[PDB]
Ligand binder design. Structure first.
Ligand SMILES: *[C@H](C)[C@H]1/C(=C/c2[nH]c(/C=C3N=C(/C=C4\NC(=O)C(CC)=C4C)C(C)=C\3CCC(=O)O)c(CCC(=O)O)c2C)NC(=O)[C@@H]1C
Ligand SMILES: *[C@H](C)[C@H]1/C(=C/c2[nH]c(/C=C3N=C(/C=C4\NC(=O)C(CC)=C4C)C(C)=C\3CCC(=O)O)c(CCC(=O)O)c2C)NC(=O)[C@@H]1C
Ligand SMILES: *[C@H](C)[C@H]1/C(=C/c2[nH]c(/C=C3N=C(/C=C4\NC(=O)C(CC)=C4C)C(C)=C\3CCC(=O)O)c(CCC(=O)O)c2C)NC(=O)[C@@H]1C
Ligand SMILES: *[C@H](C)[C@H]1/C(=C/c2[nH]c(/C=C3N=C(/C=C4\NC(=O)C(CC)=C4C)C(C)=C\3CCC(=O)O)c(CCC(=O)O)c2C)NC(=O)[C@@H]1C
Ligand SMILES: *[C@H](C)[C@H]1/C(=C/c2[nH]c(/C=C3N=C(/C=C4\NC(=O)C(CC)=C4C)C(C)=C\3CCC(=O)O)c(CCC(=O)O)c2C)NC(=O)[C@@H]1C
Ligand SMILES: *[C@H](C)[C@H]1/C(=C/c2[nH]c(/C=C3N=C(/C=C4\NC(=O)C(CC)=C4C)C(C)=C\3CCC(=O)O)c(CCC(=O)O)c2C)NC(=O)[C@@H]1C
Ligand SMILES: *[C@H](C)[C@H]1/C(=C/c2[nH]c(/C=C3N=C(/C=C4\NC(=O)C(CC)=C4C)C(C)=C\3CCC(=O)O)c(CCC(=O)O)c2C)NC(=O)[C@@H]1C
Ligand SMILES: *[C@H](C)[C@H]1/C(=C/c2[nH]c(/C=C3N=C(/C=C4\NC(=O)C(CC)=C4C)C(C)=C\3CCC(=O)O)c(CCC(=O)O)c2C)NC(=O)[C@@H]1C
Ligand SMILES: *[C@H](C)[C@H]1/C(=C/c2[nH]c(/C=C3N=C(/C=C4\NC(=O)C(CC)=C4C)C(C)=C\3CCC(=O)O)c(CCC(=O)O)c2C)NC(=O)[C@@H]1C
Lengths: 96, 161, 160, 48, 64, 160, 160, 159, 161, 160, 160, 161
C-alpha cells in the first residue's frame, strides 16, 4: 500500500530486484540478499543499523572556533549606549 | 541527521542538563557563521557542473581509467563516476550548512568502502577526485568559506581511505 | 532543527538547497539570538514554573494525588514533578532548535505506551503541560510567549 | 591509434570484463499486465 | 469477508510512457474492505479519479 | 491546489498574461494568509476535542449508536470518528490553501458512492460536519470563523 | 506554489501542518506582494522583451532564419516569437507562485519530444530564453533580477 | 493473430483436416507477403516523417494546439504524438499479419472509454489516423497502399 | 551471463582491439557447431523427464539415501533432489547452446557449495547424479553433440566438488 | 547476442528454450558467416573510414575545430577522431552480435551525461557517425550496406 | 583611492578635511575588508575567468583568431589572453582602491593609441572585457558582483 | 606451495587415478617451457634493482605520495614501499618458474588487502606500481617470456584490486 511500491511497481507490474544506488549501505546490502540461495544463509544482512559516534566537536570546526575567540577574547571592553561613568565602574573579573 | 544546534542539544540531553550559558555561546557562535555558510552553499550549487568537470579533468580523465579495460571506460561507467562525484559535492554542501560531519558518516561514508570493493571501483582514484573538487571549491567559495569547506572534503577523503 | 529539516527535504528530492530554502535558513539564524534569550528566561524560572504548574494540576485533578491515584505519595508526587521538569527542558530545547523534532524524539514517541505501563493518566499529564504553559507565558513577554506557546501546544497535542 | 589503446596491457582480459555493477541487473526481464494480453504472456507473468 | 469492486482512472502526469500501459490508466479491481480505505487515499494522492465504487461481496450494515 | 495556482490556471487556459485584476485577487489572499495560519494551529491543537464535542452534539446518545444503528458496534463507531477526523484535517488544509479544490480531489471524490454502498447515512454525516464547524468557529474566533465555515459548508454540500 | 507543496507533504504523512511548515507558509505570503511587483514589471515590458530577445537570437543563430532553418519565413518566424512569448508568460506565473512547478507542468514536460517532432533545434530555443533573461534583467532592479534569473535559469536547464 | 492461423482456426472449429481450398487461401497470402514486407520496411524508416506530416495536416495550426485545446501544453502534445506512433506501429503489424485482430486486441479495446475519461476528442484522432493513411499510401506505393489502407480504416472505424 | 560470441567481443573490447582474424576463426568455429547444438537442445528438452528418471535409477534410488535416515528420504526431500537434477539439466542445456560455461558459474555454481553444506545435502552423491545424467544425455544427443554436452556436465561436477 | 537474449527470457520463465526461440537461434547461426564478412570489410577499411568521416564532419562543422570549439588543437582533434574510431569498433561488434545490445552497453547509455560534462556537442558527434555510415556504405555491397546501415542508424538515433 | 581624492581636494582649497569628506573616509575604511574579499575571490578564479572569457570572445569574433586576424597564431593568441589577464588584474586593483583611478592610469589612457599602432581592434578587446565580467559575476555573490560590475563597466566604457 | 607438476599430480590424486598419457602430455609441455623460464628468471634477478627504480619513477615518485603528508613521505615509508615492490617482483619470478599462480595466493595475496587498509597504504597506487614493473619486465625478458611473465603480474594486480 505504501508509496515506494506505488511509485515504482504501480498496479500492473510485478516487483523486481531494484539494485538501488542511493541511500548508502543499500546497494551492498541488497546485493548480499539477492545473491543468497533459499536456505543458504539465514543470518541477518542488517541486524539493525549501528549508531555512529562523533569524530569532531562543533568547536573544532574553523568558523565556530573563530567566532568563539571573537566573543571570548574581547568579551570585556567598552560598551556603547552605556554612559561612561557606569562603564568605568563596571568590573571585569567579577567573582574570583 | 545531526547539525551543530542539535549536537549541542543532544550532548545536554544525555547529561539531562538544562541549556546553560556556555552551551548558549556555542550556539551563538554557530548563528554568526551561518550567513557565510549560506553564501558558500549558493556558490557551490551554481558552479556544481563546472566543479565536477574541472576535477575530472585534473584526475580522472586522459588516463588509463578512461582507456579500454579501465574502470571509467564505457559511457555507463563514465556517467556513474561523475554521478558519484556530484553526490560527494552535494553532501559536502549539506555538511557545510549543518556545521557537522555526521551527515557524511550517516549517508555517504557508511558502506562505501565495501560497495566500492565489490564494484572494483578504485578508492585511491576516487579520493584523488574528491581532493581535486576541494581545490576547485576553495577558489569559488573564497577564503573564509574555504577553510570550512575543506574540512568536510578532507573528512570524506579520510573515510574512503 | 529548521536547518536539518531543510536538508532532509533536499536529500529526498536529491537536489541542492533551493534559494528560497536558503533564505529561510538565513532568517532562522538571525532569529536564533532572540530565541536563545527566550529559552534562557524559562531556564531561570524553571524551578518556579514546575512548582506552580504542579499545584495547579493537583487542584485541577484531586484524583491523581489521592490514595487510588498514581501521583499519590511523596515518591510518586516527586516523579510527577520530575516528569513536568523533563517536559520543560524539552520545550527549551525546541525553542532554540526552532523545530519540534528535538522535543518529539525524546518525549512524544512511545509516550502513550510508557505511561500506559505506568498507568499514569495521559490527560492529566497534558493538563500539567498546559499549566506549565500558563506560568511560562506570564513570565515571558507577549511575542516571546507566543513563540513559546507553539512548542507548549505541540506537547499538549502530542499527549492526547 | 595510441589514444584508444590501453596504457597497460590487460594481460588477462576476463578480469577486466565483469567489473562494475553485475550483468544480472541488465539481463533480467520486466513483466506487466499490459503485455499479458495473450495466453502465453499471462503464464509468464504468473511464473514471474 | 466484504470486498469492494472499484473502477478508477489514473493519468501519467510525471512522464510520457512508450509502453502502451492501458491497464495502468484504466483499471477495475476487487479490493478487500480493509485495504480499500488506504487504496482510495493512494488513488487520490496520485490524482487519479475513482469513477465507481461498489461492495462486491458481503452485506452493508452487517454486525458480523 | 491553491488560490494562487487557481488564478494562474484560469489565466493559462485563457493564455492571458497575469493582469492587475488577477494580481488584486492574489493580494487579497496574501493579507488573509496570516489569519489562516493562526486558525490552523488552533484547530490542530484542539482537534481531538473538536471531534469529541461534535460527536456529543450529534452522533452519540442517538439511534445511530443504539443497536441496529449505523454507528453501533465498536468497529463502526471507530470508523465514523476516523471519518470525522479526515473531514477536519482536509478542511484545515483547504483553509490554508484558500481553495476548495483539495476537498474535491481528496475528500469529495468517491465518497458518495462509498457511503451509498455502505449504507452510511449522508444526512447524519452532514450534521456531524456542521457540528464540527460550530465548535471550530468558537475556537478560531470570528474573523477566522468565516473563512473556516465556507470549507465546512463545501464538504457538507458535496456529501449531500 | 509553496503552500500547495506544504499541504501535499502533510497529506502524505496524514498529519496536520507542522509549526515549521506553517512558518514557511507565513514567510511566503509576506514575500508574495514583492513577487507580484516583479511579475508586474515583466508583464508590462513583455512585448519589448520578446522583440529584443528575438533579434538577439536571430543574430546569434543566422541559420534558424535561413531557407534550410525551421524559423525561416514569416509564418515560421511568428511561431518562433510566439514560443518565446509563451515561455515569458510561464516565467511570470512562476515568480508569483514562488515555485517552478507551474512553469514545469505547462512547458517543460515532453518539451524535447514536441520540438523533435517539429524539428525545431532545442539549443536555439534555450538561447532565446537566455536572451529574454538578459533583457528582463536589465529592466528589473538587481535583487528583483536575481529572483527572476532563477526561474529563467530553470527554463534554460529544462530545455537542454 | 494471423491469416495463416485464421485459416487453421476456421478448420479447427469445423474439425476438418486441412484441404486444398484452405491451402489456396494460404497460398494467396504467401504471394501477398513479399509486398507487405517491403511496405513495412518503408513505413518503419519514414515513421517519424509520416507522423510529422500527418500532424501538420490535422493536429497543428489548430485550436487543439492553441491554449485551452486538448493538445495544448508540451505534455499533452507529446502524448498525442505518442498515440499517433502507436497507431502507425500497430497498423504496420496488422499489414504484415494480414489480419485486423491484433488491432482489436491491443489498440481498439478500451480506447474509446479511455479517451472519454481523458476528454481527448475522438473525431480529431480519427482525422489524424486518416491523414497518416494518406501519407503512408504515397510512400508505400499503390499495390501496398490498398493493403495498408484497410487497417488504417479499421482503426478509424473502431475509434 | 555471456555467450561465445559475446565473450569474444568482450575480450576484444577490454583490449580495445578491433576484431581480428584469430578472433574471427573462433567465431567461425562456433557458427558451424551451432546447428548441432540446437538439435541437441531440442532432444534434451523432449526427453528431460526420462533423463532424470534414468539417472536417478542409476545412482539415487534403491540406495541408503532413499532409505529412512538418508538425505533423499521423505517425499519432500525426494522431490527437492529431482528438482535440483532438473536445474542442472536445464542450465547445462543453456550452456551448450551458448557455447560458454559462464552462465553455470553465475547462476548454478555460485553459492551452491555453501547451500549444500548448510542443508547437509551430500555433494559426492549429487556429483554422481550429474555424471549419470551426462551418460544418459550422451546417448540421446548422439556422438558429435555428446562431446559438447559432456564438457558442461563436467564443469558443473568440478564446481560442486 | 540473440542467443543471450533467448536464454535470459527462458531463465526468467524457468523453462527450456521454446521451439520458436530455437528457430531464431538457427537463423542467426546461418546469418553469422555473412555477418562476419561484413564486419571484416569494415575493420580493414577502418583507418580510411575514420579519416574520411572526420574530414566530412569538419567541413560540415567548421566551429568544432576552431579556437572556441572543443575539437580545436591537435590533441583535441585526435581525441575527436579516437571517439569516431570507438563508435566504428562498436558498430562492427554489433554486426557480429546481430543486435545493438553490445553497442548499447558500451556507447549509448550515459553518453549524453558524459558528453555534457566534456561539453562536446552531441549533434556534431551524431553528424560524425552519419559521415562514417556514408563512407562505410560505399565500401560495402548494397545488401551488406543495408545491414550495416541499421546499426549506424541506431547510433545516430541514440545520440541527439 | 578615495583617500587620495579627498586629500587632493582639501589641499587645492588649502583647508583641513571637511567633516563630510572625513565621513566618506570612514565609510571607505569600513567597506575595505569586504572589498578585500571580493578582490581575493577574483584573483583565485583569475585563471579560469580568463580562459572562459577568451573562448567566449573567440566564438563571438571568429575573425580575430583567423589567418587574416591579429589574434591568429599561438604567439598572438597568448598575447591576447595576456591582455585579458592584465585587465583583470587592474580590475582587482580598482576594487581595493574603491576608485577607477588605479585602473585608469595603467590601462585606459593612451589605450586607443597603443592598440591602433598594434592594429588590434578595440571593440573586440571590449567584448573580451564584457565576457570576463560575465564569468566574474557568476563566481561572485550578487552584491559583490554589482560592486565588481561597476569596475568592469568602466573598462568597457573606456575602450570603444 | 604448488607448481605445475604437483598440480597435475594433485588433480590425479583426488581422482585416485594413476598418471595417464593425457596427464603426461601436460607434464611434457611444462618441461619444454622450463628452459625459457629459467632464462627469464635470471634476467629478472640481475635487473631487479633497476626494474624497481624505473617503476617507481613511472608511478610512485614526483607525486603527492612523496610530498609531505603522503603515504610514501619520510625515509621509513619510502623504504617500506620499495621493499614491498621487491617482494612482488621476487614472488612473480617464483611463480613464473613454478608455472602456477598459487604461490602468489598463498604468500602475497592472502591478507594483503586487509594489511594495506589498516596501514592506510593506497591499493590503487600499489597496483599502478605493479603494472609499471610488468611493463619494464616485459622488455628485459623478451617476447616469449613476456607473455608468461605478464600473467603473474596481472594476477597480483587483480588480487590487490
Ligand atoms: C568528435 C566527433 C567530437 C569530440 C570528441 C571529443 N571527445 C573528447 C574526450 C573524450 N571522449 C570520450 C569518449 C568515450 N569514452 C568511452 O568510453 C566512449 C564509448 C566507448 C566514448 C565515445 C572520453 C572518455 C573522453 C575523455 C578523454 C579520455 O579518454 O580520457 C574530447 C576532448 C576532451 C575535452 O573536452 O577536453 C573531444 C574533443 N569533440 C567534438 O567536438 C566532436 C564533435
Ligand atoms: C568516480 C570518481 C569513480 C568511479 C565511480 C563509479 N561508481 C560506480 C558505481 C556505484 N556508485 C555507487 C556509490 C554510491 N552510492 C551511494 O549511496 C553513495 C554515497 C551517497 C555512493 C558514493 C553505487 C552504489 C554504485 C553501484 C550502483 C549503481 O551504479 O547504480 C561505478 C560502476 C557503475 C557501473 O554501471 O558499472 C563507477 C565506475 N569509478 C571510477 O573509476 C572513479 C575513480
Ligand atoms: C492525438 C492524435 C490526439 C490526442 C491524444 C492524447 N492521448 C492522451 C492520453 C492517453 N492516450 C492513451 C491511449 C493509448 N494507450 C495505449 O495503450 C493505446 C494503444 C496502444 C493507446 C492508443 C492513454 C492510455 C492515455 C493516458 C496517458 C498515458 O501516457 O498513457 C492525451 C493526454 C490527455 C491527458 O490530459 O492526460 C492526449 C492529448 N488528443 C488530442 O487532442 C489529439 C487529437
Ligand atoms: C463503565 C465500565 C465505564 C464507563 C462507561 C461509559 N460509556 C459511555 C459512553 C458510551 N459507551 C459506549 C459503548 C459501546 N457502544 C457500542 O456499540 C459498544 C459495543 C457493543 C459499546 C461497549 C458508547 C457507544 C458510548 C457513547 C454514548 C452512547 O452510547 O450514545 C460513557 C459516557 C461518556 C460520554 O461522554 O458519553 C461512560 C461513562 N465510564 C467509566 O469510566 C467506566 C469505567
Ligand atoms: C461518521 C460521521 C458517520 C459514519 C461513518 C462511517 N464510515 C464508514 C466506513 C467508511 N467510510 C469511508 C470513508 C472515507 N474513506 C476515505 O478515503 C475518505 C476520505 C479521506 C472517507 C471520508 C470508507 C472508505 C469506509 C470503508 C472502510 C473504512 O473504514 O474506511 C463506516 C463503517 C460502515 C460499515 O458498514 O463498516 C461508518 C459508520 N457513519 C455514521 O454512522 C456517521 C453518520
Ligand atoms: C523559436 C525560439 C524556435 C522555433 C519555433 C517554432 N515553433 C513552431 C511550432 C510550434 N511550437 C510549439 C510550441 C508550443 N506549444 C505549446 O503549447 C507550448 C507550451 C506552452 C509550446 C512551447 C507548437 C505546439 C507548435 C506547433 C504550431 C502551433 O502550436 O500552432 C514552429 C513552426 C514549425 C511547425 O512545423 O509548426 C517554429 C519555427 N523554431 C526555431 O528553430 C526557433 C529556434
Ligand atoms: C504400491 C502401492 C504401488 C507402487 C509402488 C512402488 N514404489 C516404488 C519405488 C519407490 N517408492 C518410493 C516412495 C517413498 N519413499 C519415501 O520416503 C516415501 C514416504 C515415506 C515414499 C512413499 C521410493 C523412494 C521409491 C524408489 C525406490 C527406493 O526406495 O529407493 C516402486 C518401484 C518402481 C521404481 O521405478 O523404482 C514401486 C512399484 N507402484 C505400483 O505400481 C503400485 C500401485
Ligand atoms: C539430488 C541429486 C540430491 C539432493 C538434493 C536436495 N536439494 C535440496 C534443497 C535445495 N537444493 C537447492 C539447490 C539449488 N537452488 C538453486 O537455485 C540452484 C542452482 C540453480 C540449486 C542447485 C536449494 C537452494 C535447496 C533449498 C531450498 C529448496 O529445497 O528448494 C534438498 C532438500 C534438503 C533439505 O534439508 O530440505 C535435497 C534433498 N538430495 C540428495 O541427497 C541428492 C544427492
Ligand atoms: C642533494 C644534496 C642531493 C640530491 C638529491 C636528490 N633527491 C632527489 C629525489 C628525491 N629525494 C627525496 C628525498 C626525501 N624524501 C623524504 O621523505 C626525505 C626525508 C624527509 C627525503 C630527504 C625523494 C622522495 C625524492 C624523489 C622525488 C619526489 O620527491 O617525489 C633527486 C632527483 C631524483 C632522481 O634521481 O631523478 C635528487 C637529485 N641529488 C644529489 O646528487 C645531491 C647530492
Amino acid at each position: 500500500d505504501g508509496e515506494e511500491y506505488g511509485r515504482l511497481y504501480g498496479e500492473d507490474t510485478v516487483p523486481s530486484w531494484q539494485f538501488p544506488t542511493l541511500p548508502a549501505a543499500n546497494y551492498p546490502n541488497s546485493v548480499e540478499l539477492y545473491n543468497r540461495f533459499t536456505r543458504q544463509d539465514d543470518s541477518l544482512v542488517v541486524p539493525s543499523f549501528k549508531p555512529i559516534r562523533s569524530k569532531m566537536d562543533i568547536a573544532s570546526m574553523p568558523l565556530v572556533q573563530a567566532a568563539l575567540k571573537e566573543q571570548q577574547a574581547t568579551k570585556t571592553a567598552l560598551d556603547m549606549s552605556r554612559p561612561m561613568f557606569l562603564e568605568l565602574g563596571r568590573s571585569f573579573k567579577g567573582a574570583d | 541527521m545531526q547539525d551543530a544546534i542539535t549536537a549541542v542539544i543532544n550532548n545536554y540531553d544525555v547529561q539531562g542538563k538544562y541549556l546553560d550559558g556556555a552551551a548558549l555561546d556555542k550556539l551563538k557562535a554557530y548563528f554568526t557563521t551561518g550567513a557565510v555558510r549560506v553564501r558558500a552553499a549558493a556558490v557551490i550549487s551554481s558552479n556544481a557542473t563546472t566543479i565536477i568537470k574541472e576535477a575530472a579533468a585534473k584526475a580522472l580523465i586522459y588516463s588509463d581509467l578512461t582507456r579500454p579495460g579501465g574502470n571509467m571506460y564505457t559511457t555507463r561507467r563514465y556517467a556513474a563516476c561523475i554521478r558519484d562525484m556530484d553526490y560527494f559535492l552535494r553532501y559536502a554542501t549539506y555538511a557545510m550548512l549543518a556545521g557537522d560531519p555526521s551527515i557524511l558518516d550517516e549517508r555517504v561514508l557508511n558502506g562505501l568502502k565495501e560497495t566500492y570493493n565489490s564494484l572494483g571501483v578504485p578508492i585511491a582514484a576516487t579520493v584523488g577526485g574528491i581532493q581535486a573538487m576541494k581545490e576547485v571549491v576553495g577558489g569559488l567559495v573564497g577564503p573564509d568559506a574555504a577553510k570550512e569547506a575543506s574540512i568536510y572534503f578532507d573528512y570524506l577523503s579520510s573515510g574512503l581511505s | 532543527s529548521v536547518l536539518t529539516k531543510a536538508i532532509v527535504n533536499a536529500d529526498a528530492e536529491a537536489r541542492y538547497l533551493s534559494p528560497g530554502e536558503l533564505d529561510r535558513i538565513k532568517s532562522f539564524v538571525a532569529s536564533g539570538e532572540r530565541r536563545l534569550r527566550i529559552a534562557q528566561t524559562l531556564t531561570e524560572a524553571r524551578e518556579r514554573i514546575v512548582k506552580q504548574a504542579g499545584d495547579q494540576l493537583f487542584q485541577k485533578r484531586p484524583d491523581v494525588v489521592s490514595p487510588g491515584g498514581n501521583a499519590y505519595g511523596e515518591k510518586m508526587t516527586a516523579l510527577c514533578l520530575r516528569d513536568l521538569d523533563y517536559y520543560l527542558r524539552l520545550v527549551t530545547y525546541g525553542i532554540v532548535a526552532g523545530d519540534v523534532t528535538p522535543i518529539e524524539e525524546i518525549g512524544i514517541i512511545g509516550v502513550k505506551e510508557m505511561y500506559n505501563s505506568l498507568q499514569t493518566p495521559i490527560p492529566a499529564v497534558a493538563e500539567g503541560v498546559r499549566a506549565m504553559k500558563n506560568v511560562a507565558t506570564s513570565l515571558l513577554s507577549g511575542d516571546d510567549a507566543a513563540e513559546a506557546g507553539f512548542y507548549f501546544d505541540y506537547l499538549v497535542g502530542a499527549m492526547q | 591509434q595510441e589514444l584508444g589503446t590501453p596504457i597497460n596491457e590487460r594481460s588477462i582480459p576476463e578480469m577486466y570484463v565483469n567489473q562494475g555493477v553485475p550483468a544480472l541487473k541488465r539481463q533480467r526481464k520486466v513483466f506487466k499486465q499490459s503485455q499479458a494480453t495473450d495466453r502465453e504472456s499471462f503464464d509468464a507473468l504468473v511464473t514471474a | 469477508s466484504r470486498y469492494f469492486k472499484v473502477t478508477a482512472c489514473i493519468p501519467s502526469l510525471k512522464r510520457v510512457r512508450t509502453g502502451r500501459e492501458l491497464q495502468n490508466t484504466f483499471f477495475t479491481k476487487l479490493v478487500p474492505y480493509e485495504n480499500w480505505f488506504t487504496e482510495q487515499q493512494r488513488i487520490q494522492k496520485a490524482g487519479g479519479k475513482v469513477l465507481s465504487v461498489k461492495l462486491f461481496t458481503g452485506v452493508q450494515g452487517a454486525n458480523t
